[PDB]
Amino acid sequence: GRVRTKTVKRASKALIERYYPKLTLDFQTNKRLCDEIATIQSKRLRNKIAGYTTHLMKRIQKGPVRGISFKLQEEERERKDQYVPEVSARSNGVLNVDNQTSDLVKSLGLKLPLSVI
Amino acid sequence: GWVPVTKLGRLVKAGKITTIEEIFLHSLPVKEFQIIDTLLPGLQDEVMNIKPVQKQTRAGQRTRFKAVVVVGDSNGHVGLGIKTAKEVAGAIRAGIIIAKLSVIPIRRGYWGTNLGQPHSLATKTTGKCGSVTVRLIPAPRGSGIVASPAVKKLLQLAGVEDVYTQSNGKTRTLENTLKAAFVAIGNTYGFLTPNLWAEQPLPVSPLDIYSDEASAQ
Amino acid sequence: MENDKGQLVELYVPRKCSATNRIIKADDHASVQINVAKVDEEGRAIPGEYVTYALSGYVRSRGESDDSLNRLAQNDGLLKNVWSYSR
Amino acid sequence: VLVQDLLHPTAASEARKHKLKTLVQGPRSYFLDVKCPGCLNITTVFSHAQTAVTCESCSTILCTPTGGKAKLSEGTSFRRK
Amino acid sequence: SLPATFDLTPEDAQLLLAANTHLGARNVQVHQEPYVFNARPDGVHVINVGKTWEKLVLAARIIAAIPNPEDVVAISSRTFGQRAVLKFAAHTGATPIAGRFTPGSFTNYITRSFKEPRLVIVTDPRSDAQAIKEASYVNIPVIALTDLDSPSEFVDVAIPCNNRGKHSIGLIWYLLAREVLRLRGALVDRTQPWSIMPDLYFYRDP
Amino acid sequence: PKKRASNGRNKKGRGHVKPVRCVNCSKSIPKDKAIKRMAIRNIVEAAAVRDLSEASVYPEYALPKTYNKLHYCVSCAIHARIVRVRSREDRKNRAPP
Amino acid sequence: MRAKWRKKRTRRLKRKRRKVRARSK
Amino acid sequence: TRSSVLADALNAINNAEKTGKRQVLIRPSSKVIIKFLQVMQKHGYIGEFEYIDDHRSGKIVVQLNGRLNKCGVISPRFNVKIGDIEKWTANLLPARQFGYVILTTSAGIMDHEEARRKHVSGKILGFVY
Amino acid sequence: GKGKPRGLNSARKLRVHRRNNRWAENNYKKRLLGTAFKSSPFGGSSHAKGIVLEKLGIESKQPNSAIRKCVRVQLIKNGKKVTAFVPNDGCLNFVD
RNA sequence: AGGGGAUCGAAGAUGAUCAGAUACCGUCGUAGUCUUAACCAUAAACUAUGCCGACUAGGGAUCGGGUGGUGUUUUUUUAAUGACCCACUCGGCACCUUACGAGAAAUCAAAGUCUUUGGGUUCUGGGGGGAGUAUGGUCGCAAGGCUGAAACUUAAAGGAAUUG
Ligand SMILES: [Mg+2]
Ligand SMILES: [Mg+2]
Ligand SMILES: [Mg+2]
Ligand SMILES: [Mg+2]
Ligand SMILES: [Mg+2]
Ligand SMILES: [Mg+2]
Ligand SMILES: [Mg+2]
Ligand SMILES: [Mg+2]
Ligand SMILES: [Mg+2]
Ligand SMILES: [Mg+2]
Ligand SMILES: [Mg+2]
Ligand SMILES: [Mg+2]
Ligand SMILES: [Mg+2]
Ligand SMILES: [Mg+2]
Ligand SMILES: [Mg+2]
Ligand SMILES: [Mg+2]
Ligand SMILES: [Mg+2]
Ligand SMILES: [Mg+2]
Ligand SMILES: [Mg+2]
Ligand SMILES: [Mg+2]
Ligand SMILES: [Zn+2]
Ligand SMILES: [Zn+2]
């Protein structure tokens, strides 16, 4: 069956790591990119490579790849991860504690908003 | 050119640490074999043994050599290395490197009268490496190292001058015999004689002091 | 270690653990050295200057490295009401 | 653990130990003064009495014995000392 | 030693009770017992939050002192504190480790991940034990977020938590960052809280 | 060297237990040993409940079950693969499959 | 041979010898 | 049945030291124990120790200060002639420069250094280093 | 502990018990039982001379193969017949 | 020895199988298998691990006992009482994890507190064979048990683990 070897996949993470935004989703343009940015000893290997690299591209778009990150995705992750809400804790109705934990509050030097369970 | 990959080698290559005891003092784990190479030239290495052992292919046989190496100045610093190689003088080299990595501080002492610089040992100490167990006893001046040639040579390079020994177990398994004579003369600095009862402040550690001159870009 | 004429022989004098007074071996690579910051007039941690304990491998391996360490802080002031002798 | 006030154990833990295993061994048992709501006789007993104790007369019964703490018979009073 | 400033202030304990760090492990362990304040009926174990805070500040004290900011490796592999050890790492230098710890980290220098930190801060001693274990091969101290049933072996200063999720790991990590910023650096006049949100250390899916 | 700290099965604290007969090859093994299995089934079997439920009188009728505790020598339990040679560490696992 | 069949063999030997000896009071 | 009492004492101490503790419990409390504990404190191998009055034979809490390697008993309490102390110290002491072999002489219980001075001897109790 | 009595008054046991145990030591028992004087072909003496009865060509053990030249001698002092090896090339032709 | 003698079943007999098949499998079946009154004194009679004492570590079950719980559940009304639940605690059958420690390793909470060698104490071993033989004694109706050599012979026999 058609299971791509490591020499192929290795060089797929390689091109994606580096030249990500220069890459595409279409076989034919990448297939040409591989000739500029990289040296590959035979067209079929080059094609095999270029073909897996693009398969990856087509699925990196629909969510990140389990072991692959690059510049523009790292930026993408920083932003979207820095979401801050309207706070939560806050408090929306005092502090809801049971007892003993109250005894912990009292036996400490603290007033706080009351509640017993 | 030595290009240190660890924080420690950096602070060594810089002349920022001048003594090995500095490393011991802080129990800093040494990893680059050049650290000791610089911290301690004039460190002779001795070839103990090179007996071949054998295994199998997915069928038959396996030839490979087992080199045993002792490194030591002759002054409180000794190492022990054991390596196997596909080659001969390959393991030998590799062993030495592995030996220096093991270089340990020796607490020589006085048999009695503290006249004119230590000769024997602090105390009776003993080590054990699976079955073989060696035990060294402080000795009068003129006694000398009373041990089986191998163990003795390890003790010469160790910096010991006079000491009594007593073996136990299969002392014919040389590799095991030495590794315990090693464990033995390395356990000296572990023993709480009343001198060290004295209170100390504990130094700051060259890893925090020269911390700037330590880390990478 | 002295000698004939009192001169300080013996290559090096080893640290002693601060929870068991037990010598820190040159190969005791689970032996740890904590460095805690002294704080000047409110807030600002004084750089360069530490309150420092040393905890040996054996204490740490047996998991005593927190309780023991805690007693040590509370008794150099660094803690209030956490450790408690009588238990 | 590792360092502790052996000479001064807590109380709530000293009361959790076995009778013989405290700092100095001591009995967990007491004595009750027991009478019945009819008579006026101050008959003092032991927490783990092994005998069917009665009031001086009246053929009454103060407690029945067991595998431990005695069983004060039905309606009866008791102060502990 | 430490001024009345450094004392509790019910602002924090407000957060700590609300972030529910005070709720702890049903079955404890023998080393965490001083931290235990009391046991609720129906098997619960109330941590003494003041203890937590006292140790937490102590952690900061040590996170500081150590010179260079970045060789203070802060570790997680637990989801619930991966963003947290990132956000902390954002503020104080402190090179972060979220996800796979990769054995051969502190030992083994040939690796493409050879950290040589001067201090380690962990979130769960259990699920990160391989980091804990490895630290002890190479003299590195360990700050750690224990609960009541946590493998206290090969840690050092330990801050009690809930680490059963939510805000309990977020807050402690957040709070740590606050006092490492307070002490030295830039936050100052510790009386007033922080512009920086507390829900910044939390976990999402979404 | 010893292979199980269970030695053979589980006694520990007795010394002797009555022996049972192997259900299969009629051996004799101590009940404390003996690979034991229950064998509860339906008399009518799978395929046949159809004709059975059909051909009967009675409102649907409650199916009887047949019950049988089974006992096997190590020899016969192994061969009929009721139990299998597990790994050095696998052997430890007392867990039911 | 098996330890116990060895044991058997020698319990037989003894009887044989015991009876050959017997042959003189 | 208990046999030496000064055995189980020294052992507890020895045991408690090894496991990192800085306090022990010693039941029961013989005078021989205390005098030993005294000799063992005179050179600070232990710290403060406090008798506990059960209405019985006693307990003791000894405070440990590290630096103890082994406090041993020797049983049976052999007969040591004066020039045989030289021999025991040879055998069961770490170095010529320290350590102790405490005895029982008619001149009370004492470390071997002391007996060496007062010129006395008797049985052997054990050793400390 | 140890499995040997340690009493200050136990010498008898420790004494007889080893005396009892020296017997498993071969060299000791040979000496005590005077095997030397009894079963040994010499008296115990380091040498003996006897008269050569016949020449023998005993073949070697495995894995060797040769004809070791020996002689059946009859010892003068006690008439015992034992055989002895005759060392070195063709020395067997020196004895008759 | 008496009783008993269903079952299974040494010996034996048979049918198969095999080159042979005194076997394994199948069939018949003696003694035996049970009991009483006498013997016997041995088993891998095993945990292949003496007993009493002390000490060193973490966890969950479970058996017996006891204590504490304005806990649950049981009635005709919610008391006693029974079972059950939680914590504790002795004393058990064990299990789990650990590994400071021990070991040749397998592994071991003892097989640890042992060259930093001593709590008290009973027994046994001292290369492999010859050999549990010979001999003597003793007990036994007997089978046998207990006690138990040497001449000679021999360079290994043996353990644990590893890779084939
Ligand atoms: Mg041995
Ligand atoms: Mg087998
Ligand atoms: Mg069984
Ligand atoms: Mg049995
Ligand atoms: Mg047999
Ligand atoms: Mg027989
Ligand atoms: Mg027969
Ligand atoms: Mg002839
Ligand atoms: Mg037949
Ligand atoms: Mg016929
Ligand atoms: Mg036949
Ligand atoms: Mg027997
Ligand atoms: Mg015991
Ligand atoms: Mg336990
Ligand atoms: Mg009670
Ligand atoms: Mg039981
Ligand atoms: Mg292990
Ligand atoms: Mg040969
Ligand atoms: Mg084998
Ligand atoms: Mg194999
Ligand atoms: Zn009354
Ligand atoms: Zn079967």
UniProtKB/Swiss-Prot annotation, chain C:
A GO molecular function term, named singly, is: structural constituent of ribosome
Q: Which UniProt keywords apply?
A: Acetylation, Cytoplasm, Ribonucleoprotein, Ribosomal protein, rRNA processing
GO CC terms in record: cytosol; cytosolic small ribosomal subunit
Superkingdom of origin organism: Eukaryota
N-acetylmethionine PTM sites in chain numbering: M1
Work out whether the entry's keyword set contains Ribosomal protein: yes
Q: Does the keyword Transport apply?
A: no
One Pfam family named in its UniProt record: Ribosomal_S21e
Phenotype when the gene is knocked out: Reduction in growth rate, a decrease in free 40S subunits, an increase in the amount of free 60S subunits and a decrease in polysome size.
Miscellaneous: Present with 27400 molecules/cell in log phase SD medium. There are 2 genes for eS21 in yeast.
Described by its record, this protein's role is as follows: Component of the ribosome, a large ribonucleoprotein complex responsible for the synthesis of proteins in the cell. The small ribosomal subunit (SSU) binds messenger RNAs (mRNAs) and translates the encoded message by selecting cognate aminoacyl-transfer RNA (tRNA) molecules. The large subunit (LSU) contains the ribosomal catalytic site termed the peptidyl transferase center (PTC), which catalyzes the formation of peptide bonds, thereby polymerizing the amino acids delivered by tRNAs into a polypeptide chain.
Its family remark reads: Belongs to the eukaryotic ribosomal protein eS21 family.
Quote the protein name from its UniProt record: Small ribosomal subunit protein eS21A
Q: Which organism is it from?
A: Saccharomyces cerevisiae (strain ATCC 204508 / S288c)
Q: Give the gene that encodes this protein.
A: RPS21A
UniProtKB/Swiss-Prot annotation, chain E:
Question: What does the PTM comment of the record read?
Answer: N-terminally acetylated by acetyltransferase NatA.
- Any one GO molecular function term: structural constituent of ribosome
Q: Name one GO biological process term.
A: ribosomal small subunit assembly
Question: What subcellular locations does the record give?
Answer: Cytoplasm
Upon gene disruption, the observed phenotype is: Reduction in growth rate, a decrease in free 40S subunits, an increase in the amount of free 60S subunits and a decrease in polysome size.
* Keywords linked to the UniProt accession: Acetylation, Cytoplasm, Ribonucleoprotein, Ribosomal protein, Ribosome biogenesis, rRNA processing
Residues recorded with modification N-acetylserine: S1
Q: Which GO terms describe its cellular component?
A: 90S preribosome; cytoplasmic stress granule; cytosol; cytosolic small ribosomal subunit
Q: Tell me what else is known.
A: Present with 93700 molecules/cell in log phase SD medium.
What family is this? Answer: Belongs to the universal ribosomal protein uS2 family.
Q: How does it assemble?
A: Component of the small ribosomal subunit (SSU). Mature yeast ribosomes consist of a small (40S) and a large (60S) subunit. The 40S small subunit contains 1 molecule of ribosomal RNA (18S rRNA) and 33 different proteins (encoded by 57 genes). The large 60S subunit contains 3 rRNA molecules (25S, 5.8S and 5S rRNA) and 46 different proteins (encoded by 81 genes).
Q: What is the protein name stated in its UniProt record?
A: Small ribosomal subunit protein uS2A
Question: Which organism does this record belong to?
Answer: Saccharomyces cerevisiae (strain ATCC 204508 / S288c) (Baker's yeast)
The lineage, from the top, is: Eukaryota, Fungi, Dikarya, Ascomycota, Saccharomycotina
Query: From which residue to which, out of the full length, is covered?
Result: 2 to 207 of 252
Swiss-Prot record, chain G:
The organism sits in which domain of life? Eukaryota
Stretches the record annotates as Disordered: 1-25
For this chain's UniProt record, which GO biological process terms are given? cytoplasmic translation
Q: Which GO terms describe its cellular component?
A: cytosol; cytosolic large ribosomal subunit
The molecular function terms in GO held by this entry are: structural constituent of ribosome
Alphabetized, the UniProt keywords read: Cytoplasm, Ribonucleoprotein, Ribosomal protein
As for family, the record states: Belongs to the eukaryotic ribosomal protein eS32 family.
More about this protein: Present with 11900 molecules/cell in log phase SD medium. There are 2 genes for this protein in yeast.
Q: How does it assemble?
A: Component of the small ribosomal subunit (SSU). Mature yeast ribosomes consist of a small (40S) and a large (60S) subunit. The 40S small subunit contains 1 molecule of ribosomal RNA (18S rRNA) and 33 different proteins (encoded by 57 genes). The large 60S subunit contains 3 rRNA molecules (25S, 5.8S and 5S rRNA) and 46 different proteins (encoded by 81 genes).
Summarize the protein's role: Component of the ribosome, a large ribonucleoprotein complex responsible for the synthesis of proteins in the cell. The small ribosomal subunit (SSU) binds messenger RNAs (mRNAs) and translates the encoded message by selecting cognate aminoacyl-transfer RNA (tRNA) molecules. The large subunit (LSU) contains the ribosomal catalytic site termed the peptidyl transferase center (PTC), which catalyzes the formation of peptide bonds, thereby polymerizing the amino acids delivered by tRNAs into a polypeptide chain.
Protein name per Swiss-Prot or TrEMBL: Small ribosomal subunit protein eS32A
Swiss-Prot record, chain I:
The biological processes this protein is annotated with in GO are: maintenance of translational fidelity; maturation of SSU-rRNA from tricistronic rRNA transcript (SSU-rRNA, 5.8S rRNA, LSU-rRNA); regulation of translational fidelity; translation
Its post-translational modification remark reads:
Hydroxylation at Pro-63 affects translation termination efficiency. The stereochemistry of the 3,4-dihydroxyproline has not yet been determined.
Is the keyword Oxidoreductase assigned to this protein? no
Entry keyword set? Cytoplasm, Hydroxylation, Isopeptide bond, Ribonucleoprotein, Ribosomal protein, Ubl conjugation
Point out the cross-link Glycyl lysine isopeptide (Lys-Gly) (interchain with G-Cter in ubiquitin) in this chain: K55
Q: Where in the cell?
A: Cytoplasm
Sample GO molecular function, one term: structural constituent of ribosome
- Give the 3,4-dihydroxyproline positions (modified residues): P63
GO cellular component terms, alphabetically, are: cytosol; cytosolic small ribosomal subunit; ribosome
Effect ascribed to mutating P63A: Lethal mutation
Q: Which domain of life is it from?
A: Eukaryota
Asked if the keyword DNA repair belongs to this entry, the reply reads: no
What is known about its subunit structure?
Component of the small ribosomal subunit (SSU). Mature yeast ribosomes consist of a small (40S) and a large (60S) subunit. The 40S small subunit contains 1 molecule of ribosomal RNA (18S rRNA) and 33 different proteins (encoded by 57 genes). The large 60S subunit contains 3 rRNA molecules (25S, 5.8S and 5S rRNA) and 46 different proteins (encoded by 81 genes).
Q: Which family does it belong to?
A: Belongs to the universal ribosomal protein uS12 family.
Q: What else is known?
A: Present with 10600 molecules/cell in log phase SD medium.
What's the protein here called? Small ribosomal subunit protein uS12A
In the UniProt record, the gene name given for this protein reads RPS23A
